[PDB]
């Protein structure tokens, strides 16, 4: 949780703080290498998610794909992309450690093995975990009103300003982020309750108390992304070099 | 709804085989009557009987047990094991 929610957004902060305001003229020569690398992390690493036997590794590559969307909003030299990458960094840091509570948090405490192939039919004995499977997955894909879509939308828009062909190709990420996440969600959620699996406890009071915090804190940003515009409106301007 | 019993299966299979024409007699039919020997059916007539059994009950069967149901009591004890009607 502290890796994927905090250590990753640090370099999103460090590309703002270190690079952009003294490397101003060295970037505009060299942003279309950043667009190459960010696109073929979105195209490649969100496509290797499909073939994964392990269950925590999928949410790992999900973190890679969203952080690859985010740094083509920073490196846009435009005004919507900066704020879009910040709201990606604050909303992915909510939705993603909740998913790590789902994969190695709850399910590894109950059954201690993280292979996907054992895990189907989670609905019939854990209904009020299959809800947290679905609403938290559909929050990761970038359904609106969740704060991930506000960030994905503004960062794809800011990366569409700077170079529109790379933005048009990079827009396919909404599809590619739906594919593996919904494939995982409907393998876990549906089917007959598995053979290998004795029925264990429902999700307990603390593992709901964590989750509802990490869900309301996405939904508030998704209903109003402006609750933190009072902080950021200088740093939307502090990093633009379009003379 | 509608729930079958044992005697319903019984009267359906007896009135089933009384409709069929290559039987020997309409009088020698029992629960324990062999389709092959007592009824005078071929290797291939009993398959058409099984086909009518499965059409008229709804249920379909594989060939793994299509030869298992040699006598009529075995067909009835088969069909009463399936919750489909």
């Amino acid at each position: 949780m502290i890796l994927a929610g905090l250590i990753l957004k640090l370099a999103l902060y460090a590309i703002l703080r270190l690079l952009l305001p003294l490397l101003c003229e060295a970037q505009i020569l060299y942003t279309p290498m950043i667009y190459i690398i960010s696109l073929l992390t979105i195209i490649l690493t969100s496509l290797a998610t499909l073939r994964q036997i392990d269950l925590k590794v999928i949410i790992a590559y999900s973190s890679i794909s969203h952080m690859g969307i985010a740094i083509l909003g920073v490196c846009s030299n435009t005004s919507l992309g900066i704020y879009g990458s910040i709201v990606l960094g604050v909303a992915h840091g909510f939705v993603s450690p909740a998913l790590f509570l789902i994969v190695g948090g709850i399910l590894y405490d109950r059954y201690h093995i993280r292979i996907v192939n054992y895990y189907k039919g989670l609905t019939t004995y854990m209904p009020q975990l299959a809800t947290y499977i679905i609403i938290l997955s559909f929050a990761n894909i970038g359904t609106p009103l969740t704060g991930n879509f506000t960030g994905e939308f503004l960062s794809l828009q800011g990366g569409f300003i700077r170079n529109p062909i790379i933005g048009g190709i990079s827009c396919i990420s909404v599809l590619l982020a739906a594919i593996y996440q919904l494939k995982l969600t409907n393998k876990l959620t549906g089917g007959i309750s598995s053979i290998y699996m004795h029925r264990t406890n429902d999700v307990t009071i603390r593992e709901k108390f964590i989750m509802n915090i990490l869900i309301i804190s996405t939904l508030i940003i998704g209903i109003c992304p402006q609750i933190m515009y009072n902080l950021l409106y200088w740093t939307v301007n502090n990093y633009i070099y379009i003379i | 709804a509608h729930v079958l019993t044992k005697d319903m299966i019984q009267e359906r299979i007896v009135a089933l085989l009384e409709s069929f024409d290559k039987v020997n007699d309409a009088k020698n039919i029992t629960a324990t009557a062999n389709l092959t020997s007592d009824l005078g059916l071929d290797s291939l007539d009993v398959v058409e009987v099984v086909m009518a059994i499965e059409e008229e009950f709804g249920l379909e069967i594989p060939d793994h047990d299509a030869d298992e149901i040699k006598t009529v009591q075995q067909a009835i004890d088969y069909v009463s094991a399936q919750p489909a009607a």
Partner: protein, 44 residues
């Protein structure tokens, strides 16, 4: 010619004969021709 001869009787009996399969195919036609005739004669 028919091993299951008396089997497919009820496929063709008086419930499912050629006249009763087309019996109620147009249920309100015989009333609607009368009422439309009355409306045709009463509109003038």
């Amino acid at each position: 010619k028919d091993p299951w001869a008396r089997r497919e009787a009820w496929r063709y009996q008086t419930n499912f004969t050629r006249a009763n399969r087309f019996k109620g195919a147009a249920p309100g036609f015989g009333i609607a021709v009368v009422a439309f005739g009355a409306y045709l004669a009463a509109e003038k």
